Scaffold this active site. Structure first.
Site, PDB file in Angstrom:
ATOM      1  N   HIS A 102      41.979  37.616  39.492  1.00 32.62           N
ATOM      2  CA  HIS A 102      42.219  38.099  38.130  1.00 32.62           C
ATOM      3  C   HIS A 102      42.891  37.010  37.320  1.00 32.62           C
ATOM      4  O   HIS A 102      42.808  36.988  36.093  1.00 32.62           O
ATOM      5  CB  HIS A 102      43.148  39.311  38.121  1.00 32.62           C
ATOM      6  CG  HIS A 102      42.759  40.382  39.083  1.00 32.62           C
ATOM      7  ND1 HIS A 102      41.465  40.837  39.205  1.00 32.62           N
ATOM      8  CD2 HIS A 102      43.503  41.121  39.938  1.00 32.62           C
ATOM      9  CE1 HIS A 102      41.428  41.813  40.092  1.00 32.62           C
ATOM     10  NE2 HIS A 102      42.652  42.005  40.553  1.00 32.62           N
ATOM     11  N   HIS A 146      52.121  34.721  35.597  1.00 30.96           N
ATOM     12  CA  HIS A 146      50.704  34.384  35.576  1.00 30.96           C
ATOM     13  C   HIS A 146      50.328  34.173  34.119  1.00 30.96           C
ATOM     14  O   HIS A 146      51.140  34.427  33.224  1.00 30.96           O
ATOM     15  CB  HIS A 146      49.866  35.531  36.139  1.00 30.96           C
ATOM     16  CG  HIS A 146      50.064  36.827  35.419  1.00 30.96           C
ATOM     17  ND1 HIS A 146      51.084  37.702  35.729  1.00 30.96           N
ATOM     18  CD2 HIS A 146      49.402  37.377  34.373  1.00 30.96           C
ATOM     19  CE1 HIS A 146      51.040  38.735  34.908  1.00 30.96           C
ATOM     20  NE2 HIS A 146      50.029  38.564  34.077  1.00 30.96           N
ATOM     21  N   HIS A 195      46.936  34.270  30.992  1.00 31.45           N
ATOM     22  CA  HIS A 195      45.679  34.868  30.545  1.00 31.45           C
ATOM     23  C   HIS A 195      45.192  33.772  29.599  1.00 31.45           C
ATOM     24  O   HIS A 195      45.992  33.221  28.847  1.00 31.45           O
ATOM     25  CB  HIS A 195      45.903  36.156  29.747  1.00 31.45           C
ATOM     26  CG  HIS A 195      46.432  37.293  30.563  1.00 31.45           C
ATOM     27  ND1 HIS A 195      45.612  38.168  31.239  1.00 31.45           N
ATOM     28  CD2 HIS A 195      47.699  37.676  30.836  1.00 31.45           C
ATOM     29  CE1 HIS A 195      46.352  39.047  31.892  1.00 31.45           C
ATOM     30  NE2 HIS A 195      47.622  38.770  31.663  1.00 31.45           N
ATOM     31  N   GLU A 246      46.719  37.741  24.840  1.00 33.36           N
ATOM     32  CA  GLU A 246      46.482  39.172  24.848  1.00 33.36           C
ATOM     33  C   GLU A 246      47.084  39.739  23.566  1.00 33.36           C
ATOM     34  O   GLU A 246      46.410  40.442  22.811  1.00 33.36           O
ATOM     35  CB  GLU A 246      47.111  39.791  26.094  1.00 33.36           C
ATOM     36  CG  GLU A 246      46.117  40.626  26.855  1.00 33.36           C
ATOM     37  CD  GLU A 246      46.330  40.632  28.349  1.00 33.36           C
ATOM     38  OE1 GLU A 246      47.492  40.658  28.813  1.00 33.36           O
ATOM     39  OE2 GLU A 246      45.309  40.650  29.059  1.00 33.36           O
ATOM     40  N   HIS A 290      52.921  35.389  31.202  1.00 33.11           N
ATOM     41  CA  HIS A 290      53.652  36.622  31.459  1.00 33.11           C
ATOM     42  C   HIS A 290      54.606  36.476  32.640  1.00 33.11           C
ATOM     43  O   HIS A 290      54.177  36.213  33.762  1.00 33.11           O
ATOM     44  CB  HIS A 290      52.680  37.772  31.742  1.00 33.11           C
ATOM     45  CG  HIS A 290      51.925  38.239  30.535  1.00 33.11           C
ATOM     46  ND1 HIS A 290      50.789  39.015  30.625  1.00 33.11           N
ATOM     47  CD2 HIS A 290      52.130  38.024  29.215  1.00 33.11           C
ATOM     48  CE1 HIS A 290      50.323  39.251  29.410  1.00 33.11           C
ATOM     49  NE2 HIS A 290      51.118  38.660  28.537  1.00 33.11           N
ATOM     50  N   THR A 308      48.734  45.230  31.386  1.00 35.91           N
ATOM     51  CA  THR A 308      47.485  44.956  30.682  1.00 35.91           C
ATOM     52  C   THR A 308      46.257  44.930  31.586  1.00 35.91           C
ATOM     53  O   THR A 308      45.151  44.660  31.127  1.00 35.91           O
ATOM     54  CB  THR A 308      47.580  43.645  29.871  1.00 35.91           C
ATOM     55  OG1 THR A 308      47.831  42.545  30.752  1.00 35.91           O
ATOM     56  CG2 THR A 308      48.725  43.744  28.851  1.00 35.91           C
TER      57      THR A 308
END
Ligand SMILES: N#Cc1ccc(N(Cc2ccc(OS(N)(=O)=O)cc2)n2cnnc2)cc1
Ligand SMILES: [Zn+2]
Ligand SMILES: [Zn+2]
EC number: 4.2.1.1
Length: 258
Positions: free
Chosen positions: A62, A92, A94, A104, A117, A196
């Site tokens: 992910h 991590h 995104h 996000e 995050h 999320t």
């Protein structure tokens, strides 16, 4: 049909397996500066990462996560809109398929190249597993990444990605100091939200920093070389692992600054 970020198992399909996806306090959201409310009652953030103990970095399919030893009251987050202490467990990112997108949360509809995050859990609940079942169980510190000068503290992270390209791969990652990923200022926006990604539990107090950190195009480019799939399988690049902004509903975004 495990969830993912693809056209057939992505964000738009999540609600079928996780009904809460259409809940009252889902994240992320767009931060409208025309409506954000300055709250003079908000206390400054208190970040104590000098005792941070990183363990390893892993590609879980992910994103890639750097895990920390949350056994002792080491790296903790407190103050701000929080009551009590929250222990750092992992962080991590995104990111997108291009520099124009990846974050996000958005600010006045503006998307950033990526979002970091830092996940923390409320110590009053004993462990992470129990914390996620409470409306105030977690606190996630969100930091935007914009493309510009390189961020020295991020280089160690970027250089090791080459060895964890496929899902399931991991590597020892000790002695990493998360303090090198923080912006100069700690001014922030905050609101009650959710995770999320599935299970999408609404157990998060979101703390999003106003100041983004600058990373070079060369650094962010390495994020895009990771794969969603496991070794020896159809290659599918890890890009656009972000969830679209969700309805604010009856929530108010508060600002710690004027
Ligand atoms: N119940 C439950 C539960 C909680 C966290 C899980 N995570 C890590 C994770 C942390 C924060 C997050 O929220 S976010 N993106 O920071 O908003 C999304 C995923 N996980 C995924 N794969 N291995 C571990 C899995 C199940
Ligand atoms: Zn206005
Ligand atoms: Zn995240």
């Amino acid at each position: 049909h495990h969830w993912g970020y693809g056209k057939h198992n992505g964000p738009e399909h999540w609600h079928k397996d996780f009904p809460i996806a259409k809940g009252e306090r889902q994240s992320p959201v767009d931060i409208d500066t025309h409506t954000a409310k300055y709250d003079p009652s908000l206390k400054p953030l208190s970040v104590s990462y000098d005792q941070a103990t990183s363990l390893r970095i892993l590609n879980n399919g992910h994103a890639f996560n750097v895990e920390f030893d949350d056994s002792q009251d080491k790296a903790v987050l407190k103050g701000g809109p929080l009551d009590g202490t929250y222990r750092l467990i992992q962080f991590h990112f995104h990111w997108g398929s291009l520099d124009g997108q990846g974050s996000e949360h958005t600010v006045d509809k503006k998307k950033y190249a990526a979002e970091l995050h830092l996940v923390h859990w409320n110590t009053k609940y004993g462990d992470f597993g129990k914390a996620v079942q409470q409306p105030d169980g977690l606190a996630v510190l969100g930091i935007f990444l914009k493309v510009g000068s390189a961020k020295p503290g991020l280089q160690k992270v970027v250089d090791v990605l080459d060895s964890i390209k496929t899902k399931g791969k991991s590597a020892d990652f000790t002695n990493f100091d998360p303090r090198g990923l923080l912006p100069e200022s700690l001014d922030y926006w905050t609101y009650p939200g959710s995770l999320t990604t599935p299970p999408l539990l609404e157990c998060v107090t979101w703390i999003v920093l106003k100041e983004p950190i600058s990373v070079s195009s060369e650094q962010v480019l390495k994020f895009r070389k990771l794969n969603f799939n496991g070794e020896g399988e159809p290659e599918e690049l890890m890009v656009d692992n972000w969830r679209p902004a969700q309805p604010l509903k009856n929530r108010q975004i508060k600002a710690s600054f004027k």
